[PDB]
Design a protein around this nucleic acid. Structure first.
Ligand SMILES: [Mg+2]
Ligand SMILES: [Mg+2]
Ligand SMILES: [Mg+2]
Ligand SMILES: [Mg+2]
Ligand SMILES: [Mg+2]
Ligand SMILES: [Mg+2]
Ligand SMILES: [Mg+2]
Ligand SMILES: [Mg+2]
Ligand SMILES: [Mg+2]
Ligand SMILES: [Mg+2]
Ligand SMILES: [Mg+2]
Ligand SMILES: [Mg+2]
Ligand SMILES: [Mg+2]
Ligand SMILES: [Mg+2]
Ligand SMILES: [Mg+2]
Ligand SMILES: [Mg+2]
Ligand SMILES: [Mg+2]
Ligand SMILES: [Mg+2]
Ligand SMILES: [Mg+2]
Ligand SMILES: [Mg+2]
Ligand SMILES: [Mg+2]
Ligand SMILES: [Mg+2]
Ligand SMILES: [Mg+2]
Ligand SMILES: [Mg+2]
Ligand SMILES: [Mg+2]
Ligand SMILES: [Mg+2]
Ligand SMILES: [Mg+2]
Ligand SMILES: [Mg+2]
Ligand SMILES: [Mg+2]
Ligand SMILES: [Mg+2]
Ligand SMILES: [Mg+2]
Ligand SMILES: [Mg+2]
Ligand SMILES: [Mg+2]
Ligand SMILES: [Mg+2]
Ligand SMILES: [Mg+2]
Ligand SMILES: [Mg+2]
Ligand SMILES: [Mg+2]
Ligand SMILES: [Mg+2]
Ligand SMILES: [Mg+2]
Ligand SMILES: [Mg+2]
Ligand SMILES: [Mg+2]
Ligand SMILES: [Mg+2]
Ligand SMILES: [Mg+2]
Ligand SMILES: [Zn+2]
Ligand SMILES: [Zn+2]
Lengths: 102, 257, 108, 51, 66
RNA sequence: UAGCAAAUAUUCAAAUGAGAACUUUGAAGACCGAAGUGGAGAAGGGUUCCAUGAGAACAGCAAUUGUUCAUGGGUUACUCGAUCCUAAGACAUAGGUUAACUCCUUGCAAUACAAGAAGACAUUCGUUUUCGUUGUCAAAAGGGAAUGAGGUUAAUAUUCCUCAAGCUGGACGUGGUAUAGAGCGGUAACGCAAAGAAACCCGGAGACGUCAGCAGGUGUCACUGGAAGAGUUAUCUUUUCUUUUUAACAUACUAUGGCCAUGAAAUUGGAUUAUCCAGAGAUAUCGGCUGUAUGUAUGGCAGAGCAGCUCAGAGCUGUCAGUUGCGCACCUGAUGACCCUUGAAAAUCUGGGGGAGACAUAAUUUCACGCCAGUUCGUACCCAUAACCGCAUCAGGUCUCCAAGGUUAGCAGCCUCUGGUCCAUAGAACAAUGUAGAUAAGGGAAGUCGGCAAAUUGGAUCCGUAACUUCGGGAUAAGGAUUGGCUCUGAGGAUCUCAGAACUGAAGCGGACAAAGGUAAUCCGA
């Protein structure tokens, strides 16, 4: 049984608010009610508890997430780039400290 | 000769008085221990909870007191990705990792930061909002200056010795989901000083507000009000340099550059 | 059909004000005041939240009335922790000191 | 209602005593004009102040 | 009110102002000790235990029958 | 004279009295119909409560009666509440401001700060030691040490009486645990009347949202055999109703979950109504441990209570054994869904980590049984169509708990049992006009600014269902049928629903009750 064509979870809003608005919302809502894979126990049990707060039922970990997601792309980006910059910091200082021997 | 709502917000006996019963603690940094200036102190995330007025989660952090047997609890701002039971490191030598707290001068250019300090030992000032981050632009050679790029996008020079959290404030994106119902707006504003709902100044009679004109509902006097406008005078867009929406001649932002 | 009467001068229905209907030897149906249920005892460690076994779930007062048994268990942290947490504690402490010594000899 | 201060109880008691009728033998004194007690009060028609 | 199954503890209790109350029911009999914070009942079915316990009534304790 | 007309209702005999439609008993007829006209509270009232008596006035008729008048009498608590705790809050102190009055700060405690607490010896001081920044008030629904059943008064009673319990603080007595350092058992969860201790640091309970369904228990309701009583008996009815009860508290067992072994799961399994879980060890073992009763048994306890039957205050008999419910109200247990909401605190009880001190005739110890105490204040009565507020005995207003049978989707309506009530001045006539209630042949808005008002429609089952659309909707669209009674038949389950057929009536049958009239356009405001 396929119960809705366009609407899905948005159907609760019935006919209110206008289409495009509850498109935007279909999107977000499906994000927040989705189960996420826990980094720690590797189960896809992680659900959102509060706005910024996610829990994994089985492994009992709570992580600071984004509002509607577990993972905020700009935050992942900041991790990726923090690391890369760590590499460069250390490589640089450590390398030219050998020049300090002169 | 009535008193607008504009004015009624500065009254402390008043109706507009924050609803504080839910507040867990101020979210600030560690005290400025010797340990933090010359070394690193480590603590645990006992939990990250939700404060009722806050978009950003709060982290509850256990620290061992340097001078006694007591165990110190403190509440920090959630850096996105921090886990309950994480080890958080604060101080001079603390290394760069999500949620650790260093001086900015030790943080590499281009890095993303939270809860920066305006004066050294703020226990935090800048970029506390959910999802907010500040951008690290440059360091002076001396080490005493750092250029930060604030969420608003204005650049600021801060003593490099100031405390910063590596990473981004948690719970970002909430601002993006449209609020459909009015009730939502209601509950939300229920935990903060009441701003809701907002009655347009024109709905009102000349007694309740400079705007409410009368028979037609218009402002009828220029709504750009000068910075020096007296208490009950200051109503429209204040001290505004521009008014309209810029459509069309947007190439001007570029050609003007 | 028998009907009841609050016996306390508190007519409002509050979690603390609950009543139960008892049938007496008289043939009366009498209100008797029922007490409140309490939350079971949980292990105190971080994020653990396990229901402790072998300790009584009792309203805080009656805790002074019970036998030492119900107040306790026989482990290293009998009252405060569950076994799993105890175990992991032991292990962690031992192994951590081992790494400590190793670092010590590698320094000397 | 049920719940009362001491103060209350005492005040009420007072007004309760003061609410008696002139004793039938006082009207026989030589120097008195008093046929009745003019200050009597009825709970239904007039109310006291206790708060 | 406590009741006792084994005659021994009962006898330790009435051996320990002491009076003993015995009462008859159709199928059973009961012996009853008064003590500060408890009323001790002892029930038996068969007449043997019965008479044996009636024997057991000491000079210190006076026997009341209802 | 206007007027005494809302809230369906009264009637008969006796008695009392000068006098009775209005008082008391009895006999009839009706009402509130467990969303009460019932049983109790909070606010508010303050003696309005109880008994006896009664001239006037008042109780808009009346009165032999009273919420009225007079006289006397009624409110017993270790376990109920206040008192304690903290909240939204608030106020001192300190500091500062003011001509001054006043005003500003203070729990995340200060715009303050040389402010405290404890111990021991001393036992005053003093001495001495230890640790230390500094107040209070605000909840008779929040938190909150422990009590019940039976009986009693004209009026009080979880208070008094009788019987049976628990709690906290005292202080020793008698037994018993433990130790020359400080219980014993099990692999393990864990177990067992008892099994040494200070500073110090951490805990648990207290301690918590809304909604949805599932499971269990209590109370209630229903039914079954037995016994006692009562109603019906021209006829019929092995009949119809009634009683058939078990308090806190003691001991032992069981109870929706979670753990511990042993062993590991792919032809993946397990499991709920729903989800959901597993190699981060599922399923499974004559396996084991543990947590919650408003459960069971016994004690309490039958000696009480209840129902019958005698005797002239005493006496006798029975109070027994079963079954079921998507029934109902409450409580509990395990879940699920929800939030740009995420749902107090403190006092209080208790546990852990630590082992500084103390001690041989000793020292210390959450075992039993015994001895002593529990102060102060509130406890009457109304809580409303007559004890409150509405100048009143006003058709208004005023926060809660308990809830029976029948019909039914139903806590609706209608009718009933328990309990309550007939109180609203009365009699007679029966015109106009009126207030409320209905029904009108033929026509069908011609009435009227206007379909105002009325009328039609209405449940459930089966058919059938457009344009338009934000694809959710529109939608009971529109529309078409059926519905009783009776006699049979089949299907769904454990160790009450659904469907068929036949017969029968003035073609009636959601028979009362309950219960939408449609359609097509235009304008606003989402
Ligand atoms: Mg569809
Ligand atoms: Mg103020
Ligand atoms: Mg937006
Ligand atoms: Mg003006
Ligand atoms: Mg006008
Ligand atoms: Mg306009
Ligand atoms: Mg306008
Ligand atoms: Mg009062
Ligand atoms: Mg009045
Ligand atoms: Mg008045
Ligand atoms: Mg006693
Ligand atoms: Mg009239
Ligand atoms: Mg009435
Ligand atoms: Mg009533
Ligand atoms: Mg009453
Ligand atoms: Mg406060
Ligand atoms: Mg204040
Ligand atoms: Mg109590
Ligand atoms: Mg008593
Ligand atoms: Mg004691
Ligand atoms: Mg919850
Ligand atoms: Mg029967
Ligand atoms: Mg089990
Ligand atoms: Mg008897
Ligand atoms: Mg049920
Ligand atoms: Mg209810
Ligand atoms: Mg929560
Ligand atoms: Mg210990
Ligand atoms: Mg009234
Ligand atoms: Mg008449
Ligand atoms: Mg006609
Ligand atoms: Mg026609
Ligand atoms: Mg016609
Ligand atoms: Mg109409
Ligand atoms: Mg449809
Ligand atoms: Mg139809
Ligand atoms: Mg339509
Ligand atoms: Mg038929
Ligand atoms: Mg058929
Ligand atoms: Mg027919
Ligand atoms: Mg019909
Ligand atoms: Mg119409
Ligand atoms: Mg509108
Ligand atoms: Zn996990
Ligand atoms: Zn644990």
């Amino acid at each position: 049984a396929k119960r809705t064509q366009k609407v899905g979870i948005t159907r609760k809003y019935g006919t209110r608010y206008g289409a495009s608005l509850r498109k935007v919302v279909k999107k977000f809502e499906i994000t927040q009610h989705a189960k996420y894979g826990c980094p720690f126990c590797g189960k896809v049990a992680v659900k959102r508890a509060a706005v910024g707060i996610w829990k994994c039922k089985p492994c009992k970990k709570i992580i600071a997430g984004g509002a509607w997601e577990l993972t905020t792309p700009p935050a992942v980006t900041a991790k990726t780039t923090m690391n890369r910059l760590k590499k460069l910091q250390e490589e640089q200082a450590a390398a030219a400290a050998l020049e300090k021997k002169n | 000769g009535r008193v607008i709502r504009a004015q009624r917000k500065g009254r402390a006996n008043g109706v507009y008085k924050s609803h504080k019963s839910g507040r867990i603690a101020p979210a600030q940094y560690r005290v400025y221990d010797f340990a933090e200036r010359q070394g690193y102190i480590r603590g645990c995330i006992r939990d990250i909870v939700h404060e009722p007025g806050r978009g950003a989660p709060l982290a509850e952090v256990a620290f061992r007191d340097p001078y006694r047997y007591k165990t110190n609890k403190e509440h920090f701002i959630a850096a996105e990705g921090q886990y309950s039971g994480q080890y958080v490191y604060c101080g001079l030598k603390a290394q760069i990792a999500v949620g650790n707290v260093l001086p900015i001068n030790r943080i590499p250019e281009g890095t993303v930061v939270c809860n920066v300090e305006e004066k050294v030992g703020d226990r935090g000032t800048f970029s506390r909002a959910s999802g907010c981050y500040a951008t690290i632009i440059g360091h002076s050679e001396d080490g005493d200056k750092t250029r930060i790029r604030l969420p608003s996008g204005a650049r600021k020079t801060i003593p490099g010795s100031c405390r910063a959290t590596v990473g981004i404030v948690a719970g970002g994106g909430r601002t993006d989901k449209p609020i459909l119902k009015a009730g939502n707006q209601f509950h939300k504003y229920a935990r903060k000083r009441k701003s809701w709902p907002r009655v347009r100044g024109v709905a009102m009679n000349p007694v309740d507000h400079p705007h409410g004109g009368g028979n037609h509902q218009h402002i009828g006097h220029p709504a750009t009000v000068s910075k020096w406008a007296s208490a009950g005078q200051k109503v429209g867009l204040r001290a505004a340099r521009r008014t309209g929406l810029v459509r069309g001649g947007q190439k001007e932002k570029m050609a003007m550059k | 059909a028998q009907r009841i009467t609050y016996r306390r001068r508190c007519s409002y229905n509050t979690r603390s004000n609950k009543v139960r209907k008892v049938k007496t030897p008289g043939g009366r149906l009498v209100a008797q005041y029922v007490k409140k249920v309490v939350n079971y005892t949980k292990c105190s460690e971080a994020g653990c939240n396990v229901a402790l076994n072998g300790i009584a779930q009792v309203r805080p007062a009656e805790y002074a009335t019970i036998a030492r048994s119900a107040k306790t268990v026989s482990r290293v942290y009998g009252g405060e922790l569950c076994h799993t947490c105890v175990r992991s504690r032991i292990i962690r402490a031992f192994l951590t000191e081992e790494v400590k010594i190793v670092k010590r000899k590698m320094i000397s | 209602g049920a719940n009362k201060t001491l103060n209350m109880k005492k005040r009420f008691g007072r007004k309760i005593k003061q609410n008696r009728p002139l004793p039938n033998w006082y009207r026989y004194k030589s120097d008195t004009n008093i046929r009745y007690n003019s200050k009597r009060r009825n709970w239904r028609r007039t109310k006291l102040k206790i708060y | 009110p406590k009741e006792i199954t084994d005659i021994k503890k009962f006898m330790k209790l009435w051996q320990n102002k002491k009076v003993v109350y015995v009462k008859t029911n159709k199928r059973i009999t009961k012996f009853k000790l008064r003590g500060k914070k408890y009323l001790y009942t002892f029930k038996t079915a068969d007449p043997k235990i019965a008479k044996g316990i009636k024997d057991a009534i000491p000079a210190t304790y006076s026997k009341i029958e209802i």
